[PDB]
A paper describes a structure:
The axoneme, a cytoskeletal scaffold of cilia, typically exhibits a “9 + 2” microtubule arrangement in motile cilia, comprising 9 peripheral doublet microtubules (DMTs), inner and outer dynein arms (IDAs and ODAs), radial spokes (RSs), and nexin-dynein regulatory complexes (N-DRCs), all surrounding a central pair of microtubules named the central apparatus (CA). The CA primarily governs ciliary motility, functioning as a mechanical force distributor that interfaces with RSs to transmit signals throughout the axoneme. The mouse sperm CA structure is an asymmetric complex with various projections around the C1 and C2 microtubules. In addition to microtubules, CA organization can be classified into four categories: (1) microtubule outer surface proteins (MOSPs) in C1 and C2, (2) five large projections (C1a/C1e, C1b, C2a, and C2b), (3) MIPs within the C1 and C2 lumens, and (4) the bridge linking C1 and C2.
Subtomogram averaging (STA) enabled CA reconstruction at a resolution of up to 5.5 Å, providing well-resolved tertiary structures to build models of 39 CA-associated proteins. Our final model of the 32-nm CA repeating unit in mouse sperm comprises 260 tubulin and 206 non-tubulin chains. Among these, there are 45 different polypeptide chains, including 39 known proteins and 6 unknown proteins. And among the 39 known proteins, there are eight proteins newly identified as CA components: GRK3, ANKMY1, LRRC43, GOT1L1, LRRD1, MAP1S, GMCL1 (BTBD16), and SPACA9. Additionally, we provided more complete structural models for four previously identified proteins: CFAP47, HYDIN, CFAP99, and KIF9. Each microtubule consists of 13 protofilaments with seams facing each other at their connecting bridge. In the CA structure, C1 and C2 are tightly connected through four parts: a central bridge, HYDIN, and two lateral connections between adjacent projections of C1a/C1b and C2a/C2b. Specifically, HYDIN forms a semicircular chain that encircles C1 and C2, with its N-terminal half driving the C1–C2 connection and its C-terminal half providing axial support in C2. CFAP47, the core structural component of the bridge, binds C1 through its N-terminal domains, interacts with HYDIN via its central CFAP47-ring, and anchors to C2 through its C-terminal region. SPACA9 specifically binds at the intradimer interface between α- and β-tubulin, arranging itself in a spiral layout along the microtubule with an 8-nm longitudinal periodicity.
Author numbering:
A (entry chain A2): 674 to 808
B (entry chain 4N): 297 to 345
C (entry chain 4Q): 236 to 602
D (entry chain 4V), E (entry chain 4W): 16 to 404
Amino acid sequence: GVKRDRNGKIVDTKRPLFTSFQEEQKTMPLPANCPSIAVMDVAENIRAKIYAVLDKLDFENLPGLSAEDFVTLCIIHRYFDFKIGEIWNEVSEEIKLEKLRLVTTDEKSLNSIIAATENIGKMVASLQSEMIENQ
Amino acid sequence: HVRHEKEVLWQNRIFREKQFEERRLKDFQDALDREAALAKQAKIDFAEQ
Amino acid sequence: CISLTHLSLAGNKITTIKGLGTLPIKVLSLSNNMIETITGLEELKALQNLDLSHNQISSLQGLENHDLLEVINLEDNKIKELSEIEYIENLPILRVLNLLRNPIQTKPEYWFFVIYMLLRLTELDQQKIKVEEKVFAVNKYDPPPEVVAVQDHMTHVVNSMSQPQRIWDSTLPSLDAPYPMLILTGPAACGKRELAHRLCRQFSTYFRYGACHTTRPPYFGEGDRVDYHFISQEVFDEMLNMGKFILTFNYGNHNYGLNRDTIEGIARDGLASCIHMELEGVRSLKYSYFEPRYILVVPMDKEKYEGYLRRKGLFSRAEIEIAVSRVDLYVKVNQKYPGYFDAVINADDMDIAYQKLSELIREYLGL
Amino acid sequence: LEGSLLKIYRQDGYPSKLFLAYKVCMTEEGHPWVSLVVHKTRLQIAEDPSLDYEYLPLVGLKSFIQSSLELLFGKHSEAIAEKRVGGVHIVGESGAFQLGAQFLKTWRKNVKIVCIVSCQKEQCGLIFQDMGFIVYEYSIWNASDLCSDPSMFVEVLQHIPVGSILVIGNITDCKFTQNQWTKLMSIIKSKQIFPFFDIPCQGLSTGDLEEDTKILQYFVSLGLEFFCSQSLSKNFGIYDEGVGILVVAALSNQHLLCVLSQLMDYVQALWGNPPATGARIITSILCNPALFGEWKQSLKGVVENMMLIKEKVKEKLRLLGTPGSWDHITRQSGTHGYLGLTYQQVEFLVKKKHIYLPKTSRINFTCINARNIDYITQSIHEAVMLTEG
Amino acid sequence: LEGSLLKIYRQDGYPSKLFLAYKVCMTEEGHPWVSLVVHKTRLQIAEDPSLDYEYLPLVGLKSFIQSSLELLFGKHSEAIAEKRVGGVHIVGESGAFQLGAQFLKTWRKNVKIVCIVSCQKEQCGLIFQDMGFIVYEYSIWNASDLCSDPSMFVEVLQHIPVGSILVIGNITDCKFTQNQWTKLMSIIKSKQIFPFFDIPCQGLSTGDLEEDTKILQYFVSLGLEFFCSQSLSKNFGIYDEGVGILVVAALSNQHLLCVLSQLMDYVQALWGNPPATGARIITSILCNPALFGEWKQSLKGVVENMMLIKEKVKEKLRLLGTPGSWDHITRQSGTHGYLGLTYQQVEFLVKKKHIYLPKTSRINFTCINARNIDYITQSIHEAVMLTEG
């Protein structure tokens, strides 16, 4: 359910990792024992495991360089940090509906986190366009 | 990680609860201390007179 | 005129006020005058309502001698200094204050500083000082114990996050059996660091000491990168700016913090870690999710610790009383809070402390 | 007092006498149930060299307060902070009732109407009639289903008058649905009923601390106003401590402070300072994750000790030929429940087998053990034979 | 309750600020002093962590209650053989009155009247009148004596109506003379008056239990109907745990049984079950002869320290030339004693010297030590000369 263009280019800098399931899901309290949105995926995915297996084999210096390889390598490399960012973003969105008011000290750390995440996403999109131009 | 820190700063709402808790401690004593001093003002006025 | 309960000379040419002395002038309105000082008024104790607006008054020390002064009005004057704010703070009855149109009125630091000092004020420049506003001014000036600790830890998290990261060796997959970590907190060098070193001596196959960092150059007797990471203040600040700090604590205007890589290096092998900790660092640690075994090491004999620090030599005169006060504070905090620390051991004798630590470790791991 | 039942049980020379009815949670050795974490925490507490010898706080211990509020109002509760609930570190266990009675006779003296379950008649009536409050009964316990049936509670919804002091006993089995619950509160709010709760055994009533008072969390989420009593030293293992907590619930924020302005004078004129040393074990489990977990599997062992042993005893009764599968025994929540045995069967137990129990056939299932489980099943079985027919 | 003294002392920033009324038992430095037996007491409580934690009944763990019974009865007298005397577990600083005043009001229907001391009314009679009572007052804390004075006491005794109750509270300042004992007895006999006593600081009112109870020993030898209010949270000093007892005397065994039954009912109402931690902590020091004797010796030493502080304050105030009599401080007994200060001296101390104490100035002299008392007396002398001059 992850969407790209007609060639495989990233189309988002805020939530590009949201699949169809994340998009159809909203912010509500979870069921009694049903796992969260990420738990079942992590138990049943091979997404974050490709990052680990590439790390086992020297992630950044291997033969077979190309545009698609560059795009996928960058996506998989930044996926860990940006997925942590997305988890804390969905935590913030749930807090938006919690109303269980927290101290404003929690707001500034979240602001810094989302600022860094947005900068990372925008630079990743620019670097996508940059390798496309290179090829 | 931050869920724990989210809950710890939820307990900082006790400080936010302490905001008015110690206002009460002072709002009815910042008036009595002013009122307590008025007890020594009118007793010597007519006494001197 | 001893019976003079009120006096009013507004709009006159009063240069300086004299002669009044101890008159029971409860209300004094002297606006639109040429008043320059506050002389003569200081003993007007019965003066609760003072009006000196549209005047030429600058210094206000002496109106604070009006132990009953409740309302002060000095709008449109030549007041510029903030010392009178501390002076009028000593008024337990000052409830209304007016300082508009003044040059002092231009620096909102005056505004929130009046709000902070004068918690007894109910009104400042014709507004009512609010409930949350006074402690907002509190959190604008002084750094709160738990709240400055919170801000330091949040800034640590912000700077550590803002850089690329990696799966840490200190984070083990086993949730209920993670990397074994130990924290021994207490006053300044009460042997708790020596206790940790002794633990690494006997339990060499179990533990390995973790050295805290510092902004301070190497003091004599302390091994570099073994007791403290004696780096400069600039490197200390930078390696938070580079995303490697999670905590700090300040001693003698020198900050001491923990780099994550210190835990990563020891956890990279599998042997446990032991680090001596301190109050501000403990606050920053408890605000975090980190899971060591919290241990407070305190010598209850405050006089013995006092003499020990005085005879240690490397400390000046004032460095002993601070540590004694910290000892007492730790004792009170741990004796008042149930289920607070995982363990607390005496530091009056290193031998009994180490015996207690050894039996605690043996009952922990079932050795 | 009428302590003579257990007293003559103690005087009973019958070796196989078994008072299976004293409500406190047991080990199978006849001791009140203790856990290893209790002895451990007693061991670490023994290392305290110095003392803070001043009066203990009256609001309660911070971790203890947080635990009490989250158990009685929810892990995700909002009424905890803005004084829509209450927690007061009272003396003993009946101190909450007496403070509430003082508040009633001071402010709510205009109402002398009390609506309760029949099992709470004498219990709460002692305290209420000590100040003149009239008590009215409805038996929401079922003498046929041998549990608390929701149906006569939906009838009691019409039975209850307006604006009474509702004392709640064992409503766990009165399992309404969520819409039925909403109808229940719509009836209550239309009658201005002010309820009074008491949860001294949270954790062992249903096996989960949340499920015991989950209906209470949903009560306070609607803005209800009610008092409550709570104790946790019982189901934990340290029974003898006996220091409870008064729990308030309301909507207005400043009114609780106004009530506390008088409660302070009350508490000063009544005791002044209750103890909290025993509560250190309580927090030692309820705060740390490893001890919380270990004591939770200890609780699950206790769960197997009553309700799983309930099932095994029932299977043994079926094997012995006891008519009817005593499923209501397993269906009764908590460690205590009526058997439905008549007077002439309780008397058979007490005389022939000297298995003592109150006249209402309400035994305590934590007293059931696997040591002489054959004897217990045989005693119940022969009671059924010789007294049912 | 405005506990302004300690809180303002803690929140003050003056380096030479000094508090003279620490709420608990003091060293020469301001620490929560304990007898050397408490360090052993904690160790000899921890030898039994494998307890099953059996409840405390309405009577409680009668080891503690009985030990305190022989305490307040006197381990030296023979009032027990008269089987007219009993006692009941109380909690905190007020349960003794909560039982005794309630019983006296309820069952002495013809006697709703008491003549009390006004000075110790703040501690005794406020709880006494909390049980719905009508009280006459003798304010024997004379202006000249600045301590409890038997003169106006016996003067009010003369005008006491037939069928009243007499209160002799924590006013050991009135070490009533033998002639005053006989005059009191003669006035009581002609009117059938019921004596009442309150010593919340046994071993602290004068130093030893027997000296605190000297006139109490005389009354016990007389064999009268009297109650003995007491709070072991203040005499032994478990202010944290907060546990004590009340003692009743009557003229027959059936009356004593009625007292015991009514007080058990009042216990079931007020707290139901007494706490165990404080009870066992008190037991550990009461039952053990070594701990009990050394506690008595050390408490006598602390009381003599208090007396030394009183004498030193008096002598330094008279030496510096401070106006007014000063032997009134030594006339006062127990850790509580006035200084006879005016509002102006107190306000000057609070403002400039940051020494906090009420106008009555009933300071705990164990707080003051021989190290800072010189500066304290100099500051008081300065306050008096600058405010009263």
